[PDB]
């Protein structure tokens, strides 16, 4: 076997605007709240926004530490440009890891865009996704933890087809993982970690056990509780 392009680094464009409800949503008291098994509501608000970024990196380091990490907190287009282009410039043929979360940030647009500027008010911003399409034109991977990720993937095909409609003068080798299909919207059952797709891609065992213990309707082993599968 020949090819050994490893990974460059993880973008961790952790767009959360902690505590600010993206006005699309209405919660309920029984709310899905946890992310990377931390609750920000019961923690130091603007401080804890750093902690989760380091936590997520340390989980990815279990799956591979021989590649880098920038913890990118509510970044505006300029911040995004700096993050992605600097890392890509260090190694071009190597795999970049695009990773995102769509929190304190409304649903993605029909044309694949985002909602952050100077952490002002969940501020609409064009994501420069059709430029990212050459920043990621050489090998990369993408993860989209958001309420309509299949829309991001579909629109990525429409922009990639617009790249073809120039290239007529690597369409997408690069990997993509979508937390739901375009039509869907994420669950709100409080028994779920909120970053569920990431939480699976990052900590499958905790998920599997915490899923498992709820599912059946007579517990053929009856002694088990949440409390023990922690231990």
């Amino acid at each position: 076997m020949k090819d050994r392009m490893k990974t460059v680094s993880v973008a961790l464009v952790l767009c959360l605007n902690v505590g600010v409800d993206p006005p699309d949503v209405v919660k309920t008291t029984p709310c899905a709240r946890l992310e990377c098994w931390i609750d920000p509501l019961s923690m130091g608000p603007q401080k804890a926004l750093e902690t989760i970024g380091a936590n997520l990196q340390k989980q990815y380091e279990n799956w591979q530490p021989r590649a880098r990490y920038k913890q990118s907190l509510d970044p505006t287009v300029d911040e995004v440009k700096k993050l992605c282009t600097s890392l890509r410039r260090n190694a071009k043929e190597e795999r970049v890891l695009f990773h995102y979360n769509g929190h304190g940030v409304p649903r993605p647009t029909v044309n694949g865009e985002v909602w952050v500027f100077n952490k002002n008010y969940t501020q609409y911003i064009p994501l420069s996704i059709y430029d990212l399409q050459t920043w990621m034109g050489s090998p990369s991977i993408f993860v989209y933890d958001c309420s309509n990720a299949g829309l991001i993937v579909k629109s990525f095909k429409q922009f990639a087809l617009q790249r073809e409609q120039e290239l007529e003068v690597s369409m997408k080798n690069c990997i993509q993982l979508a937390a739901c299909e375009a039509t869907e919207l994420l669950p709100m059952i409080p028994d779920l970690p909120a970053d569920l797709f990431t939480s699976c891609l990052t900590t499958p065992i905790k998920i599997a056990l915490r899923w498992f213990c709820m599912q059946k309707c007579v517990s053929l082993v009856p002694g088990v509780t949440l409390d023990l599968i922690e231990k």
């Binding site: 993982l177 937390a179 299909e181 797709f197 699976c200 498992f212 599912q215 002694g223 088990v224 023990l228």
Partner: protein, 49 residues
């Protein structure tokens, strides 16, 4: 590898997560029941351990 585990839980709920390449479905496969037996065997003991 974790993506297949995701496909299971997501189809438990109302999600159908999707991939760059055009994968065939997996959620049904008999080997999953081998997983679930292995967990039950394990967690039969843990209430004493």
């Amino acid at each position: 590898r974790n993506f297949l585990l995701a496909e299971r839980i997501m189809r438990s709920y109302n999600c159908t997560p999707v991939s760059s390449p055009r994968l065939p479905p997996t959620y049904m496969h008999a080997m999953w029941q081998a997983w679930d037996l292995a967990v039950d065997i394990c967690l039969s003991q843990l209430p004493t351990i």
